[PDB]
Amino acid sequence: EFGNLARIRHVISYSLSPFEQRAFPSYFSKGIPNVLRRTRERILRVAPPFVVVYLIYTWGNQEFEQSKRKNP
Amino acid sequence: RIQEVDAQMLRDICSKYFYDQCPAVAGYGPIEQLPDYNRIRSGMFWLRF
């Protein structure tokens, strides 16, 4: 509930009207580097398990296909 | 100049200067319950008008 959540002192905040400012201010020119930075920060934690299970999926499919084949 | 003011031009002038405008807000003190600017900007108009 608003008004009794925290004790804040010596903090000033400045804003604008939504009619006084652009909706998309420097969208691509500041969005492509920031998305690239977040990607650079998170690929080494996210991607390699998915790459490993991609190789597990492909290996399992080819091993199933080879076990289908009649051994001479 | 005062005597020429009736209710019709009063609400015409007030709809000119007050209705659906973007205000300037200044708060000082325990102002946590002071609403965010979108709430004041929504309070600058009525949906019943």
Side-chain angles (χ1 to χ4, degrees):
Chain A
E1 59 272 16
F2 267 111
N4 50 1
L5 288 179
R7 172 141 294 151
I8 300 298
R9 296 193 63 196
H10 320 303
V11 172
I12 317 187
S13 314
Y14 318 90
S15 307
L16 278 196
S17 177
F19 299 91
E20 261 285 359
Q21 56 199 339
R22 282 196 306 267
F24 303 94
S26 309
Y27 196 45
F28 292 117
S29 56
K30 302 211 86 52
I32 302 289
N34 190 359
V35 160
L36 277 189
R37 185 200 44 98
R38 296 152 91 203
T39 314
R40 180 71 170 89
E41 271 166 60
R42 293 301 146 170
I43 61 170
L44 297 184
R45 291 103 177 273
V46 171
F50 299 128
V51 183
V52 170
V53 300
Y54 181 76
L55 276 296
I56 296 169
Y57 168 81
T58 54
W59 188 92
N61 292 300
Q62 93 186 352
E63 187 93 340
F64 200 36
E65 193 260 4
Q66 285 286 281
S67 56
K68 283 151 150 63
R69 290 285 107 175
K70 161 78 186 178
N71 173 44
Chain B
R1 291 251 188 81
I2 278 167
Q3 208 180 5
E4 294 294 328
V5 172
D6 68 321
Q8 170 71 270
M9 65 179 288
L10 182 63
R11 59 177 167 264
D12 289 359
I13 289 309
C14 283
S15 280
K16 161 176 213 314
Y17 286 107
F18 275 114
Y19 194 82
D20 208 15
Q21 300 299 312
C22 294
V25 194
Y28 192 27
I31 46 177
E32 194 199 334
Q33 207 180 1
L34 177 70
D36 186 75
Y37 193 84
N38 281 316
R39 311 305 298 275
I40 297 89
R41 193 47 176 83
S42 290
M44 291 294 78
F45 65 94
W46 268 351
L47 290 160
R48 72 182 81 149
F49 192 34

